[PDB]
Amino acid sequence: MEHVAFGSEDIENTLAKMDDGQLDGLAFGAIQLDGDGNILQYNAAQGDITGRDPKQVIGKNFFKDVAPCTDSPEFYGKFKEGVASGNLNTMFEYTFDYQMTPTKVKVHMKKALSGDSYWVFVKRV
Ligand SMILES: *C(=O)/C=C/c1ccc(O)cc1
Predict the structure, then answer these.
(1) What are the φ/ψ torsions at residue 15 (nearest 5 degrees)?
(2) What does the PTM comment of the record read?
(3) Three-class SS of residue 55?
C-alpha cells in the first residue's frame, strides 16, 4: 500500500514518482487525463469503485466515451476551464450513474506537475 492521503497539498509531487504499478497501491481512485480528456493512467482502486477494467479504458476519452454523466458544467466544465487557464485545484461531491449502481463520491481534480496532464482522484463518501 502507498501511503499518500487523499487531498494532500503536495500530492502532485508525490505521484510524479509512481509508475502504473505503484499507482495501484493507493487507497483512493486515480485517473490521469491529457488536456483533451483522454485517459493516460487508471488505477486499481478506481476500477473497484466503477467496475471498469483499467487496461480497457486507457486511451478512451473520459468525457465522451467512458463517463458521459460527467459531461456537464459541474464536472467537465471545471476541467476545461482548468486546462484553458493552466491551473486546476478543486474538490467536490458527485454521483456516478452510467451503466452502474449510482455511487456518490468525493472528486479532487488537480493539475499534474509536469506538462499537460491532469489528475482526477476519487473516494467513496
Ligand atoms: C458517469 O457517466 C460517470 C462514469 C464514470 C466515472 C468514473 C469512472 O472512472 C468511470 C465511469
Answers:
(1) -80, -10
(2) The 4-hydroxycinnamic acid (p-coumaric acid) chromophore is covalently bound via a thioester linkage.
(3) helix
